[PDB]
Amino acid sequence: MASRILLNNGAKMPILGLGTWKSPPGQVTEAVKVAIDVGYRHIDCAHVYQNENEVGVAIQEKLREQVVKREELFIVSKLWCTYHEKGLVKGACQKTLSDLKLDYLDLYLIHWPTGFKPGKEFFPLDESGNVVPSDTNILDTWAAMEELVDEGLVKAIGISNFNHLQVEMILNKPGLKYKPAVNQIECHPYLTQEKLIQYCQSKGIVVTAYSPLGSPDRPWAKPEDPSLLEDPRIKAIAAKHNKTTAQVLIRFPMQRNLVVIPKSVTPERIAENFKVFDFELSSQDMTTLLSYNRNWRVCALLSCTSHKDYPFHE
Ligand SMILES: NC(=O)c1ccc[n+]([C@@H]2O[C@H](COP(=O)([O-])OP(=O)(O)OC[C@H]3O[C@@H](n4cnc5c(N)ncnc54)[C@H](OP(=O)(O)O)[C@@H]3O)[C@@H](O)[C@H]2O)c1
């Protein structure tokens, strides 16, 4: 297992990163400092998580303390849906850069293929509760992303939550200048994503798996929901290898040539979750984990199911 994967912009991306969705602002600075001390070199961030300033304080202290050089870190953030307009993308990017205390991002993603009306609210609602869309299509948002590369604010651009037809629309864009480097999508044994991963990998797009532990802290968790970390069948594989269930769930995407971004704010789990370079799942174990697919999603963007660009009807 090499620690980095080559992207189609010629850069190398660490295959294990730290997620930050739902990491409280008062705990995420210490989470990111511990993560960099124990070897993480990739941090996954987003404006909509509301904690980039505190992530930035950690990154800046570890660079100032010379624990790591900026060239060895791989920092990812995401353009929120209310900034898909051409004239708002650069300012959105620069606000994230300012918050993270960086002069460039390694990777900037379109967070969802769905544009929303610009304004203060992240989810602008009509008087009945549906998201109010923006008319800007995703090909014009991609052109604005390409401008960030050419202005030196980001080294790579990519997409998140795009379905195969929407990846294909980018790939077929008239005048395309930069292909997406990454598609970040939900992926774990209950949502194995075979077809979309094979499409993206055949096009030289690297896939990042989010919610690899099934996001047990997601706000809308219902107790009858499936639970990966408590699945006896996955616990049995972990027991066979003398590893934790989280370690098997992190190693699983790594052996599919995916990047994976487990979140934790608990120092012991941050360190545990990184100790996955020392064991191998067999091909039989990988096929057995793939057989648990149920097409179950943590993140279904339920308020947007009528948006023209909603990704999950397909
Ligand atoms: N692109 C997108 O639209 C999108 C959507 C969802 C997620 N993501 C990214 O993906 C990251 C990961 O997904 P996620 O946050 O949904 O969930 P996750 O990584 O699947 O699960 C996080 C949960 O697992 C717990 N946990 C972590 N390590 C553990 C361990 N060793 N043992 C037991 N429990 C453990 C964490 O608890 P503690 O923190 O209390 O330790 C937290 O409750 C996000 O943080 C975000 O960066 C992106």
Side-chain angles (χ1 to χ4, degrees), residues 1-29 31-68 70-85 87-119 121-126 128-146 148-194 196-221 223-229 231-234 236-274 276-279 281-314:
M1 189 75 46
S3 58
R4 301 196 293 175
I5 186 165
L6 183 65
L7 304 177
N8 63 10
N9 77 334
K12 299 206 180 142
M13 180 172 185
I15 69 175
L16 182 51
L18 180 71
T20 62
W21 178 35
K22 315 166 267 54
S23 297
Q27 291 180 246
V28 72
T29 298
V32 172
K33 286 182 171 180
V34 165
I36 291 172
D37 286 346
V38 304
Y40 293 68
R41 295 293 179 260
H42 167 186
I43 312 294
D44 181 76
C45 312
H47 181 67
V48 78
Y49 301 165
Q50 299 185 228
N51 55 8
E52 290 193 315
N53 189 42
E54 293 84 355
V55 170
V57 169
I59 294 168
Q60 191 78 296
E61 279 285 46
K62 294 294 167 186
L63 291 168
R64 176 190 77 81
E65 290 169 8
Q66 291 198 119
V67 176
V68 288
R70 174 69 186 94
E71 35 265 70
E72 303 162 334
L73 288 180
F74 194 99
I75 311 300
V76 182
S77 190
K78 313 188 195 79
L79 179 74
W80 184 247
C81 302
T82 53
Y83 302 94
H84 284 198
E85 326 294 349
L88 297 183
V89 166
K90 182 179 197 192
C93 184
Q94 183 57 62
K95 167 58 165 152
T96 281
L97 290 169
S98 183
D99 288 346
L100 288 169
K101 258 78 70 188
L102 298 176
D103 54 19
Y104 67 94
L105 293 169
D106 295 274
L107 175 64
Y108 198 49
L109 304 178
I110 303 181
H111 202 147
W112 289 88
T114 54
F116 301 166
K117 182 185 87 72
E121 298 190 27
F122 293 157
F123 278 85
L125 301 185
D126 53 29
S128 314
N130 304 108
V131 75
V132 178
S134 64
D135 55 3
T136 293
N137 96 57
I138 209 51
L139 301 188
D140 287 319
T141 306
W142 186 254
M145 297 285 286
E146 292 179 324
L148 303 177
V149 177
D150 287 331
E151 297 173 312
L153 287 60
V154 309
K155 299 289 203 221
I157 50 174
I159 59 189
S160 181
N161 303 295
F162 281 44
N163 70 34
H164 101 85
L165 289 191
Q166 297 172 318
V167 174
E168 182 176 40
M169 289 279 313
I170 304 292
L171 291 176
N172 291 340
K173 175 179 180 308
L176 182 67
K177 194 172 181 185
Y178 303 113
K179 301 175 253 177
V182 167
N183 188 15
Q184 178 179 129
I185 60 172
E186 186 179 334
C187 186
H188 47 67
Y190 298 157
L191 185 70
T192 54
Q193 297 272 28
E194 275 95 333
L196 182 55
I197 291 172
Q198 176 52 207
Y199 180 78
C200 286
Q201 291 185 331
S202 79
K203 296 302 181 180
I205 300 171
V206 164
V207 170
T208 299
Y210 77 67
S211 302
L213 309 183
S215 200
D217 58 337
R218 57 201 186 282
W220 48 78
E224 359 131 26
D225 286 342
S227 165
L228 287 165
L229 286 162
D231 189 319
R233 303 171 292 180
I234 305 181
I237 291 167
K240 179 165 79 160
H241 288 283
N242 311 133
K243 292 306 256 178
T244 70
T245 307
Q247 287 166 333
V248 167
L249 289 166
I250 292 165
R251 183 68 189 200
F252 172 52
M254 293 166 64
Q255 285 189 210
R256 305 175 68 193
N257 302 308
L258 313 179
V259 177
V260 60
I261 52 173
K263 174 268 183 182
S264 180
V265 288
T266 301
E268 167 246 31
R269 292 174 170 173
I270 295 167
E272 145 178 343
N273 286 354
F274 202 72
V276 293
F277 290 90
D278 55 347
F279 77 108
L281 297 166
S282 68
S283 178
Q284 180 178 14
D285 291 330
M286 295 290 295
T287 295
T288 299
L289 289 163
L290 286 165
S291 79
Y292 301 155
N293 185 49
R294 338 165 36 117
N295 308 305
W296 180 75
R297 298 188 188 269
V298 170
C299 285
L301 202 71
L302 286 188
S303 59
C304 298
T305 56
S306 295
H307 190 297
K308 87 204 186 257
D309 299 309
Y310 182 74
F312 305 142
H313 307 311
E314 327 246 36

